[PDB]
Each structure stands twice: as structure tokens, then as C-alpha cells.
Tab-separated table of C-alpha atoms in Angstrom:
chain	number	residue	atom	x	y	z
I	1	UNK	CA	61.686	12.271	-7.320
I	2	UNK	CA	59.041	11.665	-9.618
I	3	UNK	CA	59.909	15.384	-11.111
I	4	UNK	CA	62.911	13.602	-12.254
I	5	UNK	CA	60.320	10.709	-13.693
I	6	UNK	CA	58.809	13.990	-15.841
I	7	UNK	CA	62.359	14.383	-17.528
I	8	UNK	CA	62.651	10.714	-18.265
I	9	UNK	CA	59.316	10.889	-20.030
I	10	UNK	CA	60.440	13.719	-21.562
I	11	UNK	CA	64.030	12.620	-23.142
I	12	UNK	CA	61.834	9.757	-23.973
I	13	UNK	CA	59.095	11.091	-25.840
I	14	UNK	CA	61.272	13.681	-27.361
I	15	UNK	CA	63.789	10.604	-28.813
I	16	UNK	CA	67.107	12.365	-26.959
I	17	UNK	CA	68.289	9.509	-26.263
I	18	UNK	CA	71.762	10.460	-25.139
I	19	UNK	CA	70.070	12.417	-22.106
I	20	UNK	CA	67.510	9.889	-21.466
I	21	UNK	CA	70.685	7.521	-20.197
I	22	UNK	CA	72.220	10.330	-18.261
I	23	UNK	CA	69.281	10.351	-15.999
I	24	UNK	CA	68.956	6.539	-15.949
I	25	UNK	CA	72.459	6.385	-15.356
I	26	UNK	CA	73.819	5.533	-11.773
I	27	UNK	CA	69.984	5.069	-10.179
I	28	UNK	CA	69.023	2.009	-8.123
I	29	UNK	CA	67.060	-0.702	-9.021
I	30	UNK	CA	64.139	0.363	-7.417
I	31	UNK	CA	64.776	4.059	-9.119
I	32	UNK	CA	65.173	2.620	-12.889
I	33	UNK	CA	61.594	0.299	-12.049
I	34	UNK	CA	59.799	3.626	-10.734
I	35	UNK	CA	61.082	5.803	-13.427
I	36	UNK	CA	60.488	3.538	-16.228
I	37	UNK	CA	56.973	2.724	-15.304
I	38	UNK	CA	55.463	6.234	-14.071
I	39	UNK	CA	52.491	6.643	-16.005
I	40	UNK	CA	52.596	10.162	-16.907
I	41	UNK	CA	49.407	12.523	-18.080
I	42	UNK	CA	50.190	14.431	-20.770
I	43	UNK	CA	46.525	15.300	-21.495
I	44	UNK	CA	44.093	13.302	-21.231
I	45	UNK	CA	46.188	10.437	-22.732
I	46	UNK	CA	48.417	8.526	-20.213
I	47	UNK	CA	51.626	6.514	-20.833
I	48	UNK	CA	54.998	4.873	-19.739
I	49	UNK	CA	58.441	6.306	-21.479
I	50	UNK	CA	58.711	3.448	-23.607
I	51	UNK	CA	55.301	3.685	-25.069
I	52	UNK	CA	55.947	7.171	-25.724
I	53	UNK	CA	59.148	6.835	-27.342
I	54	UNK	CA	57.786	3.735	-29.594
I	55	UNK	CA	54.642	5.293	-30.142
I	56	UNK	CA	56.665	8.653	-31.491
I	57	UNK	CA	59.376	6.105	-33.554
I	58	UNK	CA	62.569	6.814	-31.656
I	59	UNK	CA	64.274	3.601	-32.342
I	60	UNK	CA	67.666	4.451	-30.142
I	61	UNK	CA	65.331	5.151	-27.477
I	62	UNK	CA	63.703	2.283	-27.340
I	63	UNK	CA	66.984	-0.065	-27.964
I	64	UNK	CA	68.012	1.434	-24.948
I	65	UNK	CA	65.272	0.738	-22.679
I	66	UNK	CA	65.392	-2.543	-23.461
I	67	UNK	CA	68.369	-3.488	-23.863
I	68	UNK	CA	69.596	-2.204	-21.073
I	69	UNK	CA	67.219	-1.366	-18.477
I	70	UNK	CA	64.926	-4.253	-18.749
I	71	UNK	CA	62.038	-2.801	-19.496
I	72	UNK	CA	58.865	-4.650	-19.473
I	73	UNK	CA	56.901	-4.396	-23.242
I	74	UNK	CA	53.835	-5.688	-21.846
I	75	UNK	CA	53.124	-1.853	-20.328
I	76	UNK	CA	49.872	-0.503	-21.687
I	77	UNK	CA	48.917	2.923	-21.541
I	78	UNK	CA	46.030	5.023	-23.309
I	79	UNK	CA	47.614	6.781	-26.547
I	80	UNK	CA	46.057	9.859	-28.223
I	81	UNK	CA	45.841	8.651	-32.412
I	82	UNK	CA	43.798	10.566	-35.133
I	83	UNK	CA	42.103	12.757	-32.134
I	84	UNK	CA	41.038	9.998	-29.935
I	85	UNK	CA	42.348	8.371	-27.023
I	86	UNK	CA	43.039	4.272	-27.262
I	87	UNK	CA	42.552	2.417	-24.121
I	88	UNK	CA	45.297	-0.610	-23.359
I	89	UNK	CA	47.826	0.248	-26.530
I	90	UNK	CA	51.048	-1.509	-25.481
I	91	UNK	CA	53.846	0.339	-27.040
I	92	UNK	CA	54.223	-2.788	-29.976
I	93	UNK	CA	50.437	-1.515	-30.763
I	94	UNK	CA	51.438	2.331	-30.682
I	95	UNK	CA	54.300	1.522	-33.296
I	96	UNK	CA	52.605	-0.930	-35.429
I	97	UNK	CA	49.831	1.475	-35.987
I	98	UNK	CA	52.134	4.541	-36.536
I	99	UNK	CA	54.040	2.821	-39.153
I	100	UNK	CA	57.662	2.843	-36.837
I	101	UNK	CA	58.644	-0.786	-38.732
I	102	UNK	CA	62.270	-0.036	-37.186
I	103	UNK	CA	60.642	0.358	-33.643
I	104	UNK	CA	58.467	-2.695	-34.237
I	105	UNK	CA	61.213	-5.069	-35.043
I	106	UNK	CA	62.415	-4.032	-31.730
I	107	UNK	CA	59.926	-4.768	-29.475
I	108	UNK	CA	59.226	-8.167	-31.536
I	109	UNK	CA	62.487	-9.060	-31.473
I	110	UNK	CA	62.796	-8.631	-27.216
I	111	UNK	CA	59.223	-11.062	-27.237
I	112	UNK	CA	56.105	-8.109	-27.007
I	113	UNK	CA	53.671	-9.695	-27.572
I	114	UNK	CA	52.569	-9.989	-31.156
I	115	UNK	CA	48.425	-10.665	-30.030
I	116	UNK	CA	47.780	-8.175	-27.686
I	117	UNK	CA	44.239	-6.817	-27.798
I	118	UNK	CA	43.751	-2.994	-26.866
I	119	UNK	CA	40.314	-3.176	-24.885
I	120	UNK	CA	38.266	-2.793	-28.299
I	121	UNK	CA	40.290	-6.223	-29.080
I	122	UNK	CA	42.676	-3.777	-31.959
I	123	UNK	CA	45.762	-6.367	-32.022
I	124	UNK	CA	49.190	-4.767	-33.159
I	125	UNK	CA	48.457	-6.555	-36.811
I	126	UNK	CA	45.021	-4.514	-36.608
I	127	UNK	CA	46.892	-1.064	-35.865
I	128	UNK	CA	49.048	-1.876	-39.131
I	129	UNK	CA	46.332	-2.802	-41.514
I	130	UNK	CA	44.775	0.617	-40.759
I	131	UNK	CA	47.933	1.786	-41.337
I	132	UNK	CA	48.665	0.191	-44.624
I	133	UNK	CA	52.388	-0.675	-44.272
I	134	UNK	CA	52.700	-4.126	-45.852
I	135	UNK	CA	55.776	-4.340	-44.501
I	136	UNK	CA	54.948	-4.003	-40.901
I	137	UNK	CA	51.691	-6.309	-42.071
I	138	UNK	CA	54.104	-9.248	-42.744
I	139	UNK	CA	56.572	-8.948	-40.113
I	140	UNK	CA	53.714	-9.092	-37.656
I	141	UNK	CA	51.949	-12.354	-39.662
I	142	UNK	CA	55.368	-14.029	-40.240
I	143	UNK	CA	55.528	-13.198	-36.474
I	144	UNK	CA	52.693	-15.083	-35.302
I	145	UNK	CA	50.226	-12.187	-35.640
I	146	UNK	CA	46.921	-13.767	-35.359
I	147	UNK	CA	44.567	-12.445	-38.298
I	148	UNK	CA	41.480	-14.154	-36.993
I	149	UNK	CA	41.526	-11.525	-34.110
I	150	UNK	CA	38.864	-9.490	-34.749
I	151	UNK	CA	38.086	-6.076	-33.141
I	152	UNK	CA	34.991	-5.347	-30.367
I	153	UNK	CA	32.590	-5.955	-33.343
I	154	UNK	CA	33.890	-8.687	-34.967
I	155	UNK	CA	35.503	-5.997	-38.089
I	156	UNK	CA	38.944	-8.243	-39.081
I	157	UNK	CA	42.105	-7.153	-40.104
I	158	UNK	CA	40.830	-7.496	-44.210
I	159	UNK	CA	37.544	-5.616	-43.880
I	160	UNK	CA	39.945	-2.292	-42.233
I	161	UNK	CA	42.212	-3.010	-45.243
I	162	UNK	CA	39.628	-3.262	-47.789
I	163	UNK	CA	37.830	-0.147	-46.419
I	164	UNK	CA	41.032	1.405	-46.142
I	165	UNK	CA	41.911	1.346	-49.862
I	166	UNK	CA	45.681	-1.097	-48.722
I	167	UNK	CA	45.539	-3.039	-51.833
I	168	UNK	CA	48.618	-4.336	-51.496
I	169	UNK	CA	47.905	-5.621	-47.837
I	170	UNK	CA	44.727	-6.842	-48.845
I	171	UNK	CA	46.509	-9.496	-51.316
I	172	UNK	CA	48.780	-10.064	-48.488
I	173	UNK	CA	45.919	-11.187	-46.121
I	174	UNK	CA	44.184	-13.276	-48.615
I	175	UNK	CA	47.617	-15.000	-49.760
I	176	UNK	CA	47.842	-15.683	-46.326
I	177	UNK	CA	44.304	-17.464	-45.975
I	178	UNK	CA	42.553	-14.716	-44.598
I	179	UNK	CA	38.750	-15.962	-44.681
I	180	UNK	CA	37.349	-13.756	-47.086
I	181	UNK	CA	33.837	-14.641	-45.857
I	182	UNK	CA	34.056	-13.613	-41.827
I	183	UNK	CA	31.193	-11.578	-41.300
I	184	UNK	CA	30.898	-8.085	-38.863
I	185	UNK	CA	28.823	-7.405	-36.523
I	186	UNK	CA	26.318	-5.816	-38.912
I	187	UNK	CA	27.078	-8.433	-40.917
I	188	UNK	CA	29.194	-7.273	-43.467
I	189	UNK	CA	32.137	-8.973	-45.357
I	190	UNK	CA	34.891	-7.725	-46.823
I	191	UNK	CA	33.493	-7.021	-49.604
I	192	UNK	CA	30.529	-4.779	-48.385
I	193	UNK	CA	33.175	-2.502	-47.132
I	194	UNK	CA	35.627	-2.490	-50.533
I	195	UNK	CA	32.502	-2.025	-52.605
I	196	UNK	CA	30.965	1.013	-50.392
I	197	UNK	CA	34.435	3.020	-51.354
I	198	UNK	CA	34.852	2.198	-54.940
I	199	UNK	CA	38.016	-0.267	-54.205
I	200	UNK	CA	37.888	-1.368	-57.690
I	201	UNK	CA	41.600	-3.307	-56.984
I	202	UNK	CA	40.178	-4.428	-54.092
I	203	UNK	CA	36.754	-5.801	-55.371
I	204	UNK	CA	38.459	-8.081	-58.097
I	205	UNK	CA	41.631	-9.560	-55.343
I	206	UNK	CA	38.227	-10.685	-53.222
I	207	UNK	CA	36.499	-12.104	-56.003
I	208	UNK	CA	39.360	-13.907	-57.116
I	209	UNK	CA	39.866	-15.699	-53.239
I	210	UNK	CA	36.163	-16.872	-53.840
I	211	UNK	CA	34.758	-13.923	-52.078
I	212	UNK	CA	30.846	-14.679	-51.631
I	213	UNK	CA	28.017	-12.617	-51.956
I	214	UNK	CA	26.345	-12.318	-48.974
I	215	UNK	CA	23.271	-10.136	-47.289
I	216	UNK	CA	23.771	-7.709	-44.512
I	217	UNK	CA	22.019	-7.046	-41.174
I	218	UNK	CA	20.286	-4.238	-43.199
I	219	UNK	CA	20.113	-6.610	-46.436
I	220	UNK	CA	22.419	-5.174	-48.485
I	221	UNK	CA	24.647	-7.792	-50.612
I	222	UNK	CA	27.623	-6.291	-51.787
I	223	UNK	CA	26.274	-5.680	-54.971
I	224	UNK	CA	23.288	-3.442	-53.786
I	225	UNK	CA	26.175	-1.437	-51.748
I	226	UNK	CA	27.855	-0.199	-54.609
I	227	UNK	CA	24.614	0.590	-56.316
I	228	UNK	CA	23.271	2.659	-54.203
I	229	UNK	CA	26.701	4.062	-52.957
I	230	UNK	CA	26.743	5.193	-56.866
I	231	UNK	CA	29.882	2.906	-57.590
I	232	UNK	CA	28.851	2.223	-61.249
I	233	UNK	CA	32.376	0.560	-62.196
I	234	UNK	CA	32.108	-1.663	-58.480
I	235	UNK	CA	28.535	-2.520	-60.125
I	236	UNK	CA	29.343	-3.814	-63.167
I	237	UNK	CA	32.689	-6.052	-62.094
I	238	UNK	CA	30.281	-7.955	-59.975
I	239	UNK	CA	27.354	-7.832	-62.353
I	240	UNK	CA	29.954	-9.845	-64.601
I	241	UNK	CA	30.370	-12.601	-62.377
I	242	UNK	CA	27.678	-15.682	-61.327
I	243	UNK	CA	24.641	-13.895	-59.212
I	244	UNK	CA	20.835	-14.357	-58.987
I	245	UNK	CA	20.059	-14.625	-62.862
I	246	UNK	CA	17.636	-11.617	-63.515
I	247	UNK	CA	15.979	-10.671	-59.825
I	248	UNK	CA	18.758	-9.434	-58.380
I	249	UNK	CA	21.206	-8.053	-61.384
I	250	UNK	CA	18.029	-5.954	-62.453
I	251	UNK	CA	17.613	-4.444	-58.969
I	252	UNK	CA	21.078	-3.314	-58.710
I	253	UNK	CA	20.580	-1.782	-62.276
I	254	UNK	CA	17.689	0.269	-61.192
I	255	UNK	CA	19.306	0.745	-57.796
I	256	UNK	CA	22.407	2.225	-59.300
I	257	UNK	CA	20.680	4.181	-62.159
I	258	UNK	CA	18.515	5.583	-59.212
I	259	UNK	CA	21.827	6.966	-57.184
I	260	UNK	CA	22.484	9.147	-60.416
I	261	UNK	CA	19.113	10.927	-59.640
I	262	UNK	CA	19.590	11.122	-55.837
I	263	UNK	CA	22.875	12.575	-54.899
I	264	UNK	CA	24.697	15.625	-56.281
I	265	UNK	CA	28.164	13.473	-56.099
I	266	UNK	CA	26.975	12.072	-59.514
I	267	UNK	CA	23.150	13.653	-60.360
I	268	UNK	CA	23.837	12.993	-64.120
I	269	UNK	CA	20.652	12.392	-65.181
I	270	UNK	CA	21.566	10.394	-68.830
I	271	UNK	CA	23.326	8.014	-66.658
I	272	UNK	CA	19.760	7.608	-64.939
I	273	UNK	CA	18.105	6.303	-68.097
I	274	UNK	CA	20.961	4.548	-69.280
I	275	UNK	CA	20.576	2.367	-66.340
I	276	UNK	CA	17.053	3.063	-65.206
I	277	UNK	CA	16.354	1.913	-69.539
I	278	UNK	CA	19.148	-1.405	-69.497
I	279	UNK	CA	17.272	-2.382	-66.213
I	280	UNK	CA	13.819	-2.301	-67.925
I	281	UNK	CA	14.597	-4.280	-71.073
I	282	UNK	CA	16.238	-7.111	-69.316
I	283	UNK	CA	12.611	-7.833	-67.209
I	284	UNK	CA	11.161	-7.868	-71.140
I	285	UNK	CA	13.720	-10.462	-72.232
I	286	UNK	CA	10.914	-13.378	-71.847
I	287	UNK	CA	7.758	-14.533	-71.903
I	288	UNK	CA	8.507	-11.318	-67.688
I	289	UNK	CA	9.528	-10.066	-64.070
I	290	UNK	CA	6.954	-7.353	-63.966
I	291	UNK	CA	7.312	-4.242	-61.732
I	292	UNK	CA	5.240	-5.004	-58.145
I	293	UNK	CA	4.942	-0.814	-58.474
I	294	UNK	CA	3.635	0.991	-55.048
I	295	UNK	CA	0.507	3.353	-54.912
I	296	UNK	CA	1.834	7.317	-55.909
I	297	UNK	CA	3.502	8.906	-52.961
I	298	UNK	CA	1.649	11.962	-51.867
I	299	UNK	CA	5.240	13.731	-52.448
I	300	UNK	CA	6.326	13.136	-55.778
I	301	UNK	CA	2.894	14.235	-57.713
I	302	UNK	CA	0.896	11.153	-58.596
I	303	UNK	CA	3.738	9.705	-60.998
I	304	UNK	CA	3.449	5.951	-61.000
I	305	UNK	CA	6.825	4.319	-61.322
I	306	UNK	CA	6.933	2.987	-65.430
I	307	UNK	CA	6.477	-0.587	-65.955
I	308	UNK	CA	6.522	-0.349	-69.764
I	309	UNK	CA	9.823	-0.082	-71.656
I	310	UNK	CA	7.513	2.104	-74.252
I	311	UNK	CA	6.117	3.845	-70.504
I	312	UNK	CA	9.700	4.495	-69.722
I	313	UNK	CA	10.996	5.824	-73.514
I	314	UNK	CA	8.651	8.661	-73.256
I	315	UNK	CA	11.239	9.803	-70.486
I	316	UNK	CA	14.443	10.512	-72.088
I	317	UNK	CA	13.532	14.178	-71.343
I	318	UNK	CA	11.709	15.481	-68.863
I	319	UNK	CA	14.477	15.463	-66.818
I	320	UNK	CA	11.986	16.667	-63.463
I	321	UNK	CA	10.442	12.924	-64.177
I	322	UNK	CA	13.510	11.407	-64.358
I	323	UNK	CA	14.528	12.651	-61.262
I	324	UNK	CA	11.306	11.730	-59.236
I	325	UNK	CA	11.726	8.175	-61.271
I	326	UNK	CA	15.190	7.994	-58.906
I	327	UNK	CA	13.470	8.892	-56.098
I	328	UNK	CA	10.534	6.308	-56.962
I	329	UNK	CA	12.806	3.950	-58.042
I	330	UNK	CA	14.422	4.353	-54.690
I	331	UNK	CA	11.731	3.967	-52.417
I	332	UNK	CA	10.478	0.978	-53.816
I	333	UNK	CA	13.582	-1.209	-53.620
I	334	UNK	CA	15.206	0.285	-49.961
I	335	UNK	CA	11.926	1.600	-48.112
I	336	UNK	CA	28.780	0.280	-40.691
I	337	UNK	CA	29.059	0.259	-37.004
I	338	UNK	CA	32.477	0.578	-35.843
I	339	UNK	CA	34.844	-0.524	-39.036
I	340	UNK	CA	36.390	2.909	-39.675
I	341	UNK	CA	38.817	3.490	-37.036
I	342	UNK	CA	42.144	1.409	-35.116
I	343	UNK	CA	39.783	0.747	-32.339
């Protein structure tokens, strides 16, 4: 008996959906409940036939399960996606976040429910953000997705998008009041999280929903984040908007000209000065926010970090200075938990 429960699961998974209703056909009602609701291993991951089948996009399977066999959607199971397991997927979550739209109209349309939480709290609408298909996106909102629901720590549907690079969910989100300004766990907004990647699109659709510029857990703003995550263009789009007059706009300058001395992504030195240079004539624009320099690291020779804009000129060259000027630089000013994934 529940060898014929492995061929269900198997028609199921592998969308034949003409011999799926051969072997449903002419069972009893206690036969069509056990058959449609083994839980079957295959792995480590464990789910029902109608999980399977949505969470592998066979529409016809699916309209026949639940059409005509009254299958329950609110069946969870624990669904292998991008390697990992995920614990308490319903089979509206397994389609929403592998872009199925045709299979999540379905199970919409026969009332799954739109807010279900996988145990890491990943609703359906979360699945699709990571996902990027706007068009499941709306369905889901227009459907009474919830987009406050945030996942175990607190990382909402627009901080996935951002990071993710959706652009065109991301404007979606916002349009539909997103709060721009929900914080993570760490503590990061949306915008930490669109500046760390170099969403350029994505930095100016936040700024223009009144995105603010807030400190993290570690005490990064946003700005700092592209800085030192060497986003020069990120840098200067919010550099050109209202932030802390001199203090702060220097530091990323520095910051930023630093990260072109201190990864070999970028390690373009001229960029270095450029930066390291525009950062030290802006303290000199008065009469003066004068370097609080640190005693010479053992490491880096003796090699006091320059404080004069003459101190500084006599380093155009010298490229070996310049580079222990980003690593000083560095040092003075500095010495993402669970946003990356459906979970």
C-alpha cells in the first residue's frame, strides 16, 4: 500500500499527470487521504505530492489535486532549494520561491494561505522577492501578502530585494508603502544591504521613498558601507544628498579612497590619492577638522598618517606609502547575519 503512495509521489513530482489520476482513480476515501498526504523521503528533504509537484511547477498536476481530490494546501514539508533543506515550506512557499506564477495562482486561487511563515518566518511573498519575479511579487501583495513579515532576524521582504539586485520589485515594495526604514537584526536597512552590492538603481529608488541614513549594530551608516565595500559610484550618489556637513562626508572619502589601497578587486592606487587628496582639502576649507592621527603601528614602519595637504602632496608617488596610507587610513577610522538566503 504505501508502495503504491511511492508512485503517486512519483507521477507527482515528475508532472505526469495523466498517470497520477490513474492511480488516484477508483481508491476510497480513506486511500486518496493516505496517498495524498504520505510524506515521502527523497533525501534528506521530505514532502507531500502536492508540494512536490508545485514546488517542481507542474500546473496540471496540481489543478488536479485540488480540484478534484481535495487536497489540503496547508501541508508543509521540508524542500531541498539552492543546496539546503527549508523547514515548514507549504507548497504556495515552494512555488512562490521557484518562480511557478501559473502554480501560484493555483493554490491562491483554492485559499493557501498567502502568510504562511516557514519556521525561519520566510512567507510565500519572502520566497518571491528572493526570487525576483515581480509578477509573482504583486499577485501575492494584491493577495493580501503581508510585507511587514519579516524573516527569523527581522531581514524584510525589501532588504532580500535590495540585496538581491530586483530593481523592479524593489519599486514595487516601496510603491506599495514598504517602510524603507525597518531595521535587521544587526541593524541594517535597506539601504545598508543595496549599498554593500553596488545597487546603484536600487540606492537612488530608496533615496527617493525618503530612505534615512542610519548606523548599524557595527556602526556602519550606509554611506561608510559602500566606502569601504569600494562602491565609489554608491559613494558619491549619497555624498550628493543632505548628510553630516564635513565629519562624516570626509570619512567616507578617506574610507573609500582607503578600499582602493586594500583589496585587489580595485588596488588602483591613483584612485587612492584622488580620494585620499579630495578628503584632505575639504578638512582645510576653514579656519579646520584636524586629523586625531594614532601613534605609528609597529607594522607599517613608523609612517605617521599625513595631516598636511602639503604632508600628503609629497605622496603622489611612492606608491609603497600610498598603500600603507590605505592601510593607516583604515585602521584609524574602523579599528550581515542571515539576509542572503529564502530562509
Amino acid at each position: 500500500m504505501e508502495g503504491l503512495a511511492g508512485y503517486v509521489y512519483k507521477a507527482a513530482s515528475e508532472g505526469k499527470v495523466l498517470t497520477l489520476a490513474a492511480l488516484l482513480l477508483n481508491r476510497s476515501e480513506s486511500d486518496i487521504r493516505y496517498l495524498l498526504g504520505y510524506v515521502s523521503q527523497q533525501g534528506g528533504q521530505r514532502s507531500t505530492p502536492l508540494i512536490i509537484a508545485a514546488r517542481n511547477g507542474h500546473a496540471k498536476v496540481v489543478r488536479l489535486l485540488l480540484e478534484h481530490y481535495r487536497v489540503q494546501t496547508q501541508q508543509t514539508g521540508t524542500v531541498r532549494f539552492d543546496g539546503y533543506v527549508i523547514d515548514g515550506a507549504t507548497a504556495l512557499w515552494c512555488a512562490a520561491g521557484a518562480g511557478h506564477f501559473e502554480v501560484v495562482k493555483l493554490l491562491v486561487s483554492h485559499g493557501a494561505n498567502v502568510n504562511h511563515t516557514t519556521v525561519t518566518n520566510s512567507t510565500p511573498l519572502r520566497a518571491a522577492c528572493f526570487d525576483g519575479r515581480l509578477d509573482i511579487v504583486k499577485y501575492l501583495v494584491e493577495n493580501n501578502a503581508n510585507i511587514s513579515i519579516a524573516n527569523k532576524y527581522d531581514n524584510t521582504c525589501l532588504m532580500i530585494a535590495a540585496y538581491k539586485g530586483h530593481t523592479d520589485v524593489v519599486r514595487y515594495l516601496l510603491e506599495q508603502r514598504a517602510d524603507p526604514n525597518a531595521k535587521a537584526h544587526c541593524g541594517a536597512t535597506a539601504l545598508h544591504f543595496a549599498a554593500e552590492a553596488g545597487h546603484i538603481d536600487i540606492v537612488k529608488e530608496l533615496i527617493k521613498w525618503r530612505a534615512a541614513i542610519v548606523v548599524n549594530g557595527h556602526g556602519m551608516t550606509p554611506l561608510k558601507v559602500a566606502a569601504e565595500s569600494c562602491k565609489a559610484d554608491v559613494v558619491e550618489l549619497l555624498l550628493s544628498h543632505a548628510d553630516c556637513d564635513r565629519r562624516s562626508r570626509i570619512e567616507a572619502l578617506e574610507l573609500l579612497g582607503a578600499s582602493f589601497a586594500n583589496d585587489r578587486e580595485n588596488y588602483d592606487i591613483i584612485k587612492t590619492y584622488h580620494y585620499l587628496y579630495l578628503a584632505m582639502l575639504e578638512r582645510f576649507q576653514d579656519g579646520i577638522l584636524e586629523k586625531e592621527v594614532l601613534p605609528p603601528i609597529h607594522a607599517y614602519g613608523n609612517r605617521t598618517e599625513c595631516r598636511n595637504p602639503q604632508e600628503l602632496e609629497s605622496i603622489r608617488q611612492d606608491r609603497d606609502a600610498l598603500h600603507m596610507e590605505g592601510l593607516i587610513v583604515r585602521e584609524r577610522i574602523l579599528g550581515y547575519r542571515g539576509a542572503v538566503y529564502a530562509d
